[PDB]
Structures are given as C-alpha cells and as structure tokens.
Design a protein around this ligand. Structure first.
Ligand SMILES: Nc1nc2c(ncn2[C@@H]2O[C@H](COP(=O)(O)OP(=O)(O)O)[C@@H](O)[C@H]2O)c(=O)[nH]1
Ligand SMILES: [Mg+2]
Length: 428
C-alpha cells in the first residue's frame, strides 16, 4: 500500500514552521527527511497519538504519512483536476489569538475550489492567559485541567474564529464536537510550543485519510538551479535512467533520469537505483531548463509513444494558454505554477476581466513586449496581472519605459482591486 500525503498551509507568522518542527521531534523506523518533505512511519505516528488512543481501539491501516511543508501556494502547484496526486489532505494553520487573516482566507477559497479536504490547526493555545501546559498531551485531556477563566477565553476565541469561518462560507466545529466530516470542517487546537493537540491532529488526519480516501503519479514541486527538479512521487516507481517527459516553458522536455537523490544522513546526497511512493525526491537530468512547477512527470515505457506523451504533459499548460479572448483585447496574466495560473484565470473570468495574453514563470521582457502590443491595440488593457511571481528588473525597466503597468500580488483579490483602480484612472 502507499502513504497518504498531507500538505501544511498557513499565513506567515502563524506558526506552521514551528508546528512542523514540533511534529518532527522524536526519541530516535524513524522519521526521515526527504526532498521537500518529511516521512512518518506508522510506528512513529502510533507513538505520537498513543496518548489519545489509550484503549487501542483505533486501527492504523496505513504504512505511513508524508507531510509536505507548503508555505505560500505550493499545495496548489498542479492543475485542480489532479490535486489529490499532490495533496490527499491539508492542514490549515490559524493563529487562535488573531483569528482569520487575508492569506488564510485566500487559502480557504483555493482549498474549497480544488475540493481539497483539510483540517484546521487552531495554533498557539498556550498563549491563552493562565494556560497550564502538559507537554505533548491530547487537547481534551489538557483542557479538562485548565481553570475556569482559561476555558472561558478558549470558548470565546473559538466562537469568534467560528464566526470568521462562517462568513467565508465554512461551517466549522471543534473536532471532538464535530460529528459529520461532510458537514463541518474540524478545528483542532494546537500548540507548536508545548505539542498539545498534535496527537489529536495526527490521529484525525490518519482517520480522515483512511475512512474517506481508502499508474504513475509524480509532480514537479520545485525547480532549482545544474538545473534539478524536486518531485513528489505520489504513486508508482521511478528508476535511474528512466525516460521522462515533463512540461517546459518553451515546449515539452524529454530526458533521462541521471540520478535519484535524497539528503544524506558523508556526501551531500545519496543516490538511488529506484524510489517508490510516497516519496519526495530530487531528480538530476540533462536539459531540465525551463521546467514548469506543478507539471506532471511521465515515464516513457517500451510500448509508449513519446510524442503522444509529450503532447499530454504539455496539454495542461496549453489548456491554460488557450484560455484567452477571441477579440484579442485584454490584459496579460502571469503566475508561477500551473495551479496558480489556473486559479488566476478562473478568478479573472469570474470578474469578467478579459485576458489576451497568458504567461508562466517569472516575467521577462518578451512577456512585457507581448503585453505592449495591446498598447497599440487597446491601451487600457496594456497591463499585466502577476500572481505570486518574480518580475525581472529589465522587464520592469522596459515596462516603465514603454508605459506598461505591471501589477503584482501575493493575493489574487489585490490584482482585481489594482486593475479596477487602473481602469477608473483611465476613465478619470
Ligand atoms: N507561544 C507559542 N508561540 C508559537 C507557537 N507557534 C509558533 N510560535 C512562535 O511564533 C513564531 C512563528 O514562527 P514560524 O514557525 O516560522 O511561523 P510561520 O512563519 O507561520 O512559519 C515563532 O517565532 C514562534 O516562536 C505556539 O504554539 N505557541
Ligand atoms: Mg513558514
């Protein structure tokens, strides 16, 4: 069998890094660091959840859990239709003391559109005034030992957070009060500081994956400059020397896996003849320049037709490139990954904003030039809406020289706001 994959999402300063760090802690099958991910064998999970499984009734049917730290939008890297190949389930981290934030809200909307199951970590409960910690305890067990004032503050903050979620269209319940997984999103109070609530969280993640979610699937999660690719192997086997095709900026990329690399526990990496799901692995291969984050990775077998596979891997990006106005009058859009780009196109289509040009990866002069033609065509739309992407300095300079506006945002809403402001300025 294989291990479910869990992605951890959160607003900055919400304690996701500290949380994953606390989840990693061990007395040591050992918890093992992998490329862009951390693997938890079922024994380690049993140990971390034992305190909330004292009777032993809970059955683990799973070999392990893979957890990917996904700060920002990497959990949404691939196209929506394949979301489960990247993340079976997610953990959304919210600071209980400040409640819902904008990045959190965007994360919520994106998780909902992609139909990605998630639970919420209501983190930093130790910040409750007078909280009496019991390290690594289950939340209920610790909560029972708190004074009246602490319980009161918890309930108040909880009701408030529940309201903020309700406004966003999500019905939420405290996890042990939660009765139906289909009806409510579970809120699990946690402390990255004390470890409290983490047993509950791991047990719940495992429970949901098993109860609800009981061919090769591999996704390019990151591209690192020679150029190597960090890949999440969700299903199947990858082997050294495998003939692979993936999505590239200027067309399909076809090459052969030179090396399968994981971090050394010495040299820097250890090589593998082969790796099996679920695994985060680094791939070394010639000609990986222009690889697209969020791209599928396909292996060309003996019966397979490499051309058809090239077409198939490029088809995601092409499906995005084709989503443009027939009129040819519209804005240019750009994003870092297939999923982010898809989200941007869907959002703008909802906003009835017309798009004439679609780009992926960091913004370069060619993208800005392409936008610049609109300036001759229809000047008002000679702008770029750029979602979570870097803008090359020369591209920005060229834009400023030629009166092309480049709008950038970490949140998709802001692109809309900025564009509306721009249009009102043009009509002003
Ligand atoms: N008291 C307390 N502090 C926390 C907790 N989780 C995170 N922090 C603090 O908040 C800061 C958040 O750090 P980090 O883990 O990088 O949060 P991130 O930016 O969302 O990844 C850290 O300096 C921690 O000291 C918690 O459960 N309790
Ligand atoms: Mg972080």
């Amino acid at each position: 069998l294989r291990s479910p994959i869990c992605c951890i999402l959160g607003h900055v300063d919400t304690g996701k890094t500290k949380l994953l760090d606390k989840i990693r802690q061990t007395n040591v099958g050992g918890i093992t660091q992998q490329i862009g991910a951390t693997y938890f064998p079922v024994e380690a999970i049993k140990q971390k959840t034992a305190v909330v499984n004292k009777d032993g009734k809970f059955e683990f049917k799973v070999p392990g859990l893979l957890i990917i730290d996904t700060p920002g939008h990497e959990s949404f890297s691939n196209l929506r239709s394949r979301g489960s190949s990247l993340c079976n389930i997610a953990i959304l981290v919210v600071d209980i003391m400040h409640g819902l934030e904008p990045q959190t809200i965007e994360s919520l909307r994106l998780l909902r559109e992609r139909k990605t199951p998630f639970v919420v970590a209501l983190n930093k409960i130790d910040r409750l005034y007078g909280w009496k910690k019991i390290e690594n305890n289950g939340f209920r067990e610790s909560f029972a030992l708190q004074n009246k004032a602490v319980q009161n503050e918890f309930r108040n903050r909880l009701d408030q957070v529940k309201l903020q979620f309700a406004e966003q269209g999500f019905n939420s319940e405290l996890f042990y009060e939660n009765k139906n997984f289909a009806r409510y999103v579970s809120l699990v109070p946690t402390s990255a500081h004390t470890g409290e609530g983490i047993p509950d969280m791991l047990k719940l993640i495992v429970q949901l994956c098993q109860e609800r979610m009981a061919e090769l699937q591999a996704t390019v999660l990151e591209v690192k400059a020679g150029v190597t690719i960090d890949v999440i192997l969700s299903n199947g086997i990858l082997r050294e020397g495998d003939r692979i095709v993936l999505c590239g900026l200027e067309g399909p990329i076809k090459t052969n896996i030179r090396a399968l690399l994981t971090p050394a526990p010495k040299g820097q990496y250890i090589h593998h003849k082969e790796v099996k799901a679920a695994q985060g692995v680094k791939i070394s291969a010639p000609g990986l320049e222009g690889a697209i984050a969020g791209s599928r990775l396909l292996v060309v077998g003996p019966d397979d037709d490499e051309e058809e596979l090239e077409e198939e891997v490029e088809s995601d990006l092409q499906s995005l490139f084709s989503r443009v106005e027939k009129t040819g009058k519209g804005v240019s859009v750009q994003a870092s990954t297939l999923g982010s780009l898809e989200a941007l196109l869907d959002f703008l289509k909802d906003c009835k904003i017309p798009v004439a040009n679609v780009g992926i990866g960091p913004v370069y002069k060619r993208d800005v030039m392409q936008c610049g033609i609109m300036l001759e065509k229809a000047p008002d739309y000679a702008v770029m809406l750029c979602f979570d992407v870097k803008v090359d300095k020369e591209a920005q300079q060229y834009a400023d020289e030629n009166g092309i506006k480049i709008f950038t945002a970490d949140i998709i809403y802001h692109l809309f706001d900025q564009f509306t402001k721009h249009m009102q300025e043009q009509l002003e």
